[PDB]
Ligand binder design. Structure first.
Ligand SMILES: Nc1ncnc2c1ncn2[C@@H]1O[C@H](CSCC[C@H](N)C(=O)O)[C@@H](O)[C@H]1O
Ligand SMILES: Nc1ncnc2c1ncn2[C@@H]1O[C@H](CSCC[C@H](N)C(=O)O)[C@@H](O)[C@H]1O
Ligand SMILES: [Zn+2]
Ligand SMILES: [Zn+2]
Ligand SMILES: [Zn+2]
Ligand SMILES: [Zn+2]
Ligand SMILES: [Zn+2]
Ligand SMILES: [Zn+2]
Lengths: 428, 428
């Protein structure tokens, strides 16, 4: 209303569009909007951090792309595009008579996919994926000191790595360490779900020493299980994401379990004066709260690094990584073994309409024998870069096993992160 | 009817689809259909040669893609695709109830653009661009001897080239020779249209010696204007194409003018025993008659080479080249100066809906300021690889000047053809 008056004053060439916050009309313009033209206030930045990568059950976005709010959104008909524009923003930026006429247009593209990209009051920024990548380096609100860089140990003095993995799951971390060829002295792993225990037990041949709940692990246990060289972990994102219809709380349950990772990290950290190389990785999803992200950043005493798996795999798996692993910032490289198209990850006799599937109405992504079908479990394993038939251990249902796969880290992303640890520990 | 009974016998698994000609149902199966599954009789090959690259004023194909005939065609809604499938072929290859239901589907893709690409009675063969390229090397019906290869003259003995150009137009051939840096001793050029004379006169600075009509050039004129080292030419394709609505004849007018090229070629050819390097190029369009193409091949005593300009420029300019220039067969290489996208050839402030434009309701190809607009004349010059503002010589209308541009050869294609002549003649 006020913001509509503001945009009116802009289009009469009395105000610039870059001096106003196009999302909510605030005069407190600190940032520029990354995708489109206009300013950006800090409250809208927080709403943009929370809401931008939130998708409905539909597969399309939970909220409007422009303001991250809105009332009734307009979904994009273009293939593989999931954006939504609410009616109130299109009333401004395209005009008050063009939203209604654009609904009537049955093949309707959105304004990030428009074959032009230059409209009257709304024009798209020259480099938006670059500004989306820079927008998370723009999160300097939480300013910290850089992680301490330890000088590399000589190759003759290297020893097998010792990993304390919390929230192990299906043993993605040890699998990636074996893929890199790093000698593993021992791999302690706390985990509760029996199926994920079992996957790890069979795929890693009894090498993993299994613990009960993370809440049963004392500091005495951490001291007596040998010094650890690498502590890894990732909080549950079943409740923390907006994909679950049952969002009774946000940091009930999952939040607790983060602090369990925090405590055992401090229990495994060497003392000051003990300059031995120690490393740690935490992982969380991007569709999360701001104050949540702040508290996590403050407790772990570091700046998160967003890493999307689209750069290396066939999925849209954008995840925050906290840590001190060297080269956590450096850009991702996709090897020729990694399959950047979805079609390569399909079985034979199946052809994909999508090029990237995202799993946290075309719910089922595969057109085989003139019929819609979901990705088979072994293909979902291929999508994340697991070895072929990785989860076929025990007599478990398909729904459970898909659910067991979807929680897991993306394997070439974790390979990219763990790769400079070869410089610090022994090889096979 | 008979072919519909035949396909009925094929769906019972009593006959292979590859043993029948899917176009017209003939049992005389010599070839396989290049795009889809099925045989191909020779009459259908001739109909395929004539009709496949024929486009209506719409921009879309003149006839069906499958059988090159049909009754009522179904046009494809996908962007940049111009194929049409007639109702009678879709009755077979997809089914007698699916054509009617596929009309009702408003975003309808065709079966060369189908996301799945695998239908019940119609499937798409995999290496179809390779088989489309091989299909014109499959024209061995006109078998001839290969063009005589002359050994290269040493670099100190090279002399400036002497070109007899017939049907010069806007002096594309001399411009391409100057682009290559070859010294030109003289450039005789017959041409009748004043505007094209004038373009050549101004852009090539009075170097061109202009003649009247080609029918006024005697063998005495050919002898007295010096020995020629390179004779080039191209028949008019205004009447010869199906794009002109006034197709009263096919080889009235244009056919004559071909024979004028034929005669003056023989008049410019050195005698047997005179082993001096002599070369010649003829050009014609691909949407032409078969017996036309035969007669041309027989008179010029060679096999045509189809060359599409899409490989090097932003247009679809598929043209037959007869000649003896070395490396006329070898595959086209597009330099970094050549613009393979249409958008790069646009002016600033204009954004293209297409990536390629071919011009022999999206009739106007450019979305600028919420409005549909023709390519400007200087952009059409950029599309074919002419220098910028090439035709802005005299006070001529826009319709005439566009018409003057559209007839012309594609400049990087002619650069690709003329390039090995540097090995035979002097450089600047
Ligand atoms: N208290 C607890 N202790 C250990 N594991 C727990 C736990 N509560 C939940 N989990 C498990 O921890 C996982 C959360 S996320 C798992 C991702 C893991 N990196 C992987 O690649 O598999 C789930 O498998 C969940 O069942
Ligand atoms: N009898 C004739 N003598 C010479 N030129 C003729 C002619 N009849 C037609 N022409 C011209 O020859 C051209 C046919 S095609 C021209 C293409 C030429 N290579 C170019 O790049 O411009 C047209 O410009 C036409 O006007
Ligand atoms: Zn705001
Ligand atoms: Zn909005
Ligand atoms: Zn879109
Ligand atoms: Zn036939
Ligand atoms: Zn047909
Ligand atoms: Zn199509």
């Amino acid at each position: 209303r006020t913001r509509e008056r503001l945009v009116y004053e802009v289009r009469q060439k009395c105000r610039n569009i870059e001096d106003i916050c196009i999302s909510c009309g605030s005069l407190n313009v600190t940032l520029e909007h990354p995708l489109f033209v206009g300013g950006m206030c800090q409250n809208c930045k927080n709403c943009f951090l929370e809401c931008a990568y939130q998708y409905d059950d539909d597969g399309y976005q939970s909220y409007c792309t422009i303001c991250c709010g809105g009332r009734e959104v307009l979904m994009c008909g273009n293939n593989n595009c999931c954006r939504c524009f609410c009616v109130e923003c299109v009333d401004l930026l395209v005009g008050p008579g063009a939203a209604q006429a654009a609904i009537k247009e049955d093949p309707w593209n959105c304004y990030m996919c428009g074959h032009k990209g230059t409209y009257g009051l709304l024009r798209r920024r020259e480099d938006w994926p670059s500004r989306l990548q820079m927008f998370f380096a723009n999160n300097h609100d939480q300013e910290f000191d850089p992680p301490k860089v330890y000088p590399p140990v000589p190759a003759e003095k290297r020893k097998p790595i010792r990993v304390l993995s919390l929230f192990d799951g299906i043993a993605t971390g040890l699998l990636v360490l074996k893929d890199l060829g790093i000698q593993v002295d021992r791999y302690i792993a706390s985990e509760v779900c029996e199926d994920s225990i079992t996957v790890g037990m069979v795929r890693h041949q009894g090498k993993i020493m299994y613990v009960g709940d993370v809440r049963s692990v004392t500091q005495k246990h951490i001291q007596e299980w040998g010094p650890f060289d690498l502590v890894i972990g990732g909080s549950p994102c079943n409740d923390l994401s907006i994909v679950n219809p049952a969002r009774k709380g946000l940091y009930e349950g999952t939040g607790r379990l983060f602090f369990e990772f925090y405590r055992l990290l401090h229990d495994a950290r060497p003392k000051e004066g003990d300059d031995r190389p120690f490393f740690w990785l935490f992982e969380n999803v991007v569709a999360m709260g701001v104050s949540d992200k702040r508290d996590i950043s403050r407790f772990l005493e570091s700046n998160p690094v967003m890493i999307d798996a689209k750069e290396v795999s066939a999925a849209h798996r954008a995840r925050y990584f906290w840590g001190n692993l060297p080269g956590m910032n450096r850009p991702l490289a996709s090897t020729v073994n990694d399959k950047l198209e979805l079609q390569e990850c399909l079985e034979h006799g199946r052809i994909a309409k999508f090029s990237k599937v995202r799993t946290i109405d075309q719910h089922f992504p595969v057109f085989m024998n003139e019929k819609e079908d979901i990705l088979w479990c072994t293909e979902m394993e291929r999508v994340f870069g697991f070895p072929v038939h990785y989860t076929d251990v025990s007599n478990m249902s398909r729904l459970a096993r898909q659910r067991l796969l979807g929680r897991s880290w993306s394997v070439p992303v974790i390979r990219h992160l763990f790769a400079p640890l070869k410089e610090y520990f022994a090889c096979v």
